[PDB]
Design an enzyme around this catalytic site. Structure first.
Site, mmCIF file in Angstrom:
data_model
loop_
_atom_site.group_PDB
_atom_site.id
_atom_site.type_symbol
_atom_site.label_atom_id
_atom_site.label_comp_id
_atom_site.label_asym_id
_atom_site.label_seq_id
_atom_site.Cartn_x
_atom_site.Cartn_y
_atom_site.Cartn_z
ATOM 1 N N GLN A 198 0.852 -1.194 0.000
ATOM 2 C CA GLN A 198 0.000 0.000 0.000
ATOM 3 C C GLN A 198 0.880 1.233 0.000
ATOM 4 O O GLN A 198 1.786 1.343 0.807
ATOM 5 C CB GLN A 198 -0.892 0.032 1.250
ATOM 6 C CG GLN A 198 -1.754 -1.207 1.342
ATOM 7 C CD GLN A 198 -2.640 -1.200 2.553
ATOM 8 O OE1 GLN A 198 -2.833 -0.177 3.207
ATOM 9 N NE2 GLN A 198 -3.186 -2.361 2.854
ATOM 10 N N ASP A 258 3.329 14.054 -19.029
ATOM 11 C CA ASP A 258 4.137 14.604 -20.117
ATOM 12 C C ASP A 258 5.600 14.691 -19.725
ATOM 13 O O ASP A 258 6.468 14.504 -20.580
ATOM 14 C CB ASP A 258 3.551 15.949 -20.591
ATOM 15 C CG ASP A 258 3.345 16.988 -19.505
ATOM 16 O OD1 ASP A 258 3.566 16.745 -18.272
ATOM 17 O OD2 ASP A 258 2.847 18.085 -19.908
ATOM 18 N N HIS A 291 8.348 12.735 -21.685
ATOM 19 C CA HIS A 291 9.415 13.549 -22.268
ATOM 20 C C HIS A 291 10.767 12.945 -21.939
ATOM 21 O O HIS A 291 11.603 12.758 -22.851
ATOM 22 C CB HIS A 291 9.282 14.994 -21.752
ATOM 23 C CG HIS A 291 10.417 15.918 -22.065
ATOM 24 N ND1 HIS A 291 10.280 17.042 -22.869
ATOM 25 C CD2 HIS A 291 11.706 15.904 -21.659
ATOM 26 C CE1 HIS A 291 11.481 17.606 -22.944
ATOM 27 N NE2 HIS A 291 12.385 16.966 -22.230
ATOM 28 N N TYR A 333 23.065 16.826 -28.294
ATOM 29 C CA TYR A 333 22.326 17.751 -27.415
ATOM 30 C C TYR A 333 22.900 19.164 -27.405
ATOM 31 O O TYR A 333 23.251 19.693 -26.344
ATOM 32 C CB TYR A 333 22.249 17.169 -26.004
ATOM 33 C CG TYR A 333 21.056 17.666 -25.212
ATOM 34 C CD1 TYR A 333 19.752 17.369 -25.573
ATOM 35 C CD2 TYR A 333 21.267 18.419 -24.067
ATOM 36 C CE1 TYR A 333 18.655 17.821 -24.837
ATOM 37 C CE2 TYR A 333 20.186 18.906 -23.340
ATOM 38 C CZ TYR A 333 18.892 18.623 -23.738
ATOM 39 O OH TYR A 333 17.810 19.080 -23.011
ATOM 40 N N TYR A 388 4.157 22.212 -12.299
ATOM 41 C CA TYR A 388 4.769 23.532 -12.192
ATOM 42 C C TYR A 388 3.864 24.494 -11.414
ATOM 43 O O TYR A 388 2.634 24.551 -11.588
ATOM 44 C CB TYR A 388 4.910 24.007 -13.635
ATOM 45 C CG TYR A 388 5.724 25.275 -13.843
ATOM 46 C CD1 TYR A 388 7.023 25.387 -13.416
ATOM 47 C CD2 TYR A 388 5.132 26.380 -14.461
ATOM 48 C CE1 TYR A 388 7.762 26.542 -13.628
ATOM 49 C CE2 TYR A 388 5.870 27.516 -14.719
ATOM 50 C CZ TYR A 388 7.160 27.616 -14.260
ATOM 51 O OH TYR A 388 7.873 28.762 -14.457
ATOM 52 N N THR A 389 4.556 25.255 -10.559
ATOM 53 C CA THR A 389 3.974 26.388 -9.806
ATOM 54 C C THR A 389 2.617 26.056 -9.206
ATOM 55 O O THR A 389 1.570 26.520 -9.686
ATOM 56 C CB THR A 389 3.961 27.678 -10.658
ATOM 57 O OG1 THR A 389 3.216 27.437 -11.837
ATOM 58 C CG2 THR A 389 5.342 28.154 -10.976
HETATM 59 C C1 LIG Z 1 9.872 18.015 -19.477
HETATM 60 C C2 LIG Z 1 10.207 18.821 -18.423
HETATM 61 C C3 LIG Z 1 11.524 18.467 -17.742
HETATM 62 C C4 LIG Z 1 11.503 19.139 -16.437
HETATM 63 C C5 LIG Z 1 12.772 18.745 -18.632
HETATM 64 N N1 LIG Z 1 14.046 18.217 -18.062
HETATM 65 C C6 LIG Z 1 12.947 20.221 -18.981
HETATM 66 O O1 LIG Z 1 12.268 20.659 -19.906
HETATM 67 N N2 LIG Z 1 13.788 20.960 -18.271
HETATM 68 C C7 LIG Z 1 14.052 22.341 -18.683
HETATM 69 C C8 LIG Z 1 13.084 23.351 -18.065
HETATM 70 C C9 LIG Z 1 13.386 23.657 -16.626
HETATM 71 C C10 LIG Z 1 13.015 22.589 -15.750
HETATM 72 C C11 LIG Z 1 13.127 22.977 -14.309
HETATM 73 N N3 LIG Z 1 14.106 24.057 -14.031
HETATM 74 C C12 LIG Z 1 15.487 22.709 -18.335
HETATM 75 O O2 LIG Z 1 15.914 23.802 -18.814
HETATM 76 O O3 LIG Z 1 16.179 21.890 -17.726
HETATM 77 CA CA LIG Z 2 1.098 26.247 -12.028
HETATM 78 CA CA LIG Z 3 0.717 18.732 -20.812
HETATM 79 CA CA LIG Z 4 3.129 0.768 2.582
HETATM 80 ZN ZN LIG Z 5 14.474 17.167 -22.272
#
Ligand SMILES: CC[C@H](C)[C@H](N)C(=O)N[C@@H](CCCC[NH3+])C(=O)O
Ligand SMILES: [Ca+2]
Ligand SMILES: [Ca+2]
Ligand SMILES: [Ca+2]
Ligand SMILES: [Zn+2]
Ligand SMILES: [Ca+2]
Length: 316
Positions: free
Chosen positions: A61, A138, A142, A157, A193-194
């Site tokens: 649980q 999401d 993602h 990247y 978020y927020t």
């Molecule tokens: C999909 C969202 C996930 C948090 C991802 N790693 C991302 O988009 N991060 C960018 C936005 C800021 C996330 C929290 N500061 C980032 O720039 O890392």
């Molecule tokens: Ca929010």
């Molecule tokens: Ca969404």
């Molecule tokens: Ca438990």
């Molecule tokens: Zn990403």
């Protein structure tokens, strides 16, 4: 761990009850044996040593506050696996049922989530900027999509290839959110978020400029921040993807929408058959054109809409 497959119950980050696949061997572990070589969820215990400890629970649980990020990481990894298998006939991120591993409770007040080359990692947030980030389907999808990309196109990247990498993660993160069909939208991370602010998100695919991101190539960022703008310039591709699916007129260019399923088919084929580590935005347009030609024919509406959408965001 070796054991017998069980079904636990718990609550996720937003307070929703769900069933989770677990494994019993003295304790009940967050180990789902029903999907590929397994989905495994770990406790990082507020530290940064990875993966930490395979999540153990005495009674199957998972209703404690501390449990909620684990429940959701585990459950939403399952949904994401199901999306790839059922929609794209892909078995896990490597196409051969690789184990999917996630750690929660990473660090203290950590306002992000990431794929580290081997696994998923989720912060708890600081409680103001974010709540625990595995609460966002999401977000989970993602991050797992980065693993897919890394195994397939291998987009580097940085710069335009990195912005494609990011957009692909936003596109499939959103398509998984629609697949699960709870509260889907074309926004990224709204559910985590927020917590003090209603209606915002990290990014918008429908209107990237709502959060300061470009929606046309002419507005692309060319500085050095953010690996050359990978989460900024993703807006150009996210907008194109949104237009392909939903249609619209953008900077005077009209696009006829072809819907989410076709968007997904076209981009999944581009990702897996045509994109390369060094693909730029021009090359993505070519890959998406070729993919839609393969699937639908060169004189199709689908091909026409792909071209119109890239035209609309300034990508030739
Ligand atoms: C999909 C969202 C996930 C948090 C991802 N790693 C991302 O988009 N991060 C960018 C936005 C800021 C996330 C929290 N500061 C980032 O720039 O890392
Ligand atoms: Ca929010
Ligand atoms: Ca969404
Ligand atoms: Ca438990
Ligand atoms: Zn990403
Ligand atoms: Ca949503």
């Amino acid at each position: 761990i070796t054991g017998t497959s069980t079904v636990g119950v718990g609550r996720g980050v937003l307070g929703d009850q769900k069933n989770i696949n677990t494994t019993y061997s003295t304790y009940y572990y967050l180990q789902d044996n029903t999907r590929g070589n397994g989905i495994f969820t770990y406790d990082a215990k507020y530290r940064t040593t990875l993966p930490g400890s395979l999540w153990a629970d005495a009674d199957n649980q998972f209703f404690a506050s501390y449990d909620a990020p684990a429940v959701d990481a585990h459950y939403y990894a399952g949904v994401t696996y199901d999306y790839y298998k059922n929609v794209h006939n892909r078995l896990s991120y490597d196409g051969n049922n690789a184990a999917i591993r996630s750690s929660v409770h990473y660090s203290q007040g950590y306002n992000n989530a990431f794929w580290n080359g081997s696994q998923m990692v989720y912060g708890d947030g600081d409680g103001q900027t974010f709540i625990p980030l595995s609460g966002g389907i999401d977000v989970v999808a993602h991050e797992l999509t980065h693993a897919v990309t890394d195994y397939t196109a291998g987009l580097i990247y940085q710069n335009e290839s990195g912005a494609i990498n990011e957009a692909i993660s936003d596109i499939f993160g959103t398509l998984v959110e629609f697949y699960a069909n709870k509260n889907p939208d074309w926004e990224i991370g709204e559910d985590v978020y927020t917590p003090g602010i209603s209606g915002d998100s990290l990014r918008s695919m429908s209107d990237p400029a709502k959060y300061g991101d470009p929606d046309h190539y002419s507005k692309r960022y060319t500085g050095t921040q953010d690996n050359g703008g990978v989460h900024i310039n993703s807006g150009i591709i996210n907008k194109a993807a949104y237009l392909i699916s939903q249609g619209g007129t953008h900077y005077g260019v009209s696009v006829v929408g072809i819907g989410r399923d076709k968007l997904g088919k076209i981009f999944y084929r581009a990702l897996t058959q045509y994109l390369t580590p060094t693909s730029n935005f021009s090359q993505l347009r070519a890959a998406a054109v070729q993919s839609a030609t393969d699937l639908y024919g060169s004189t199709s509406q689908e091909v026409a809409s792909v071209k119109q959408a890239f035209d609309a965001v300034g990508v030739k």
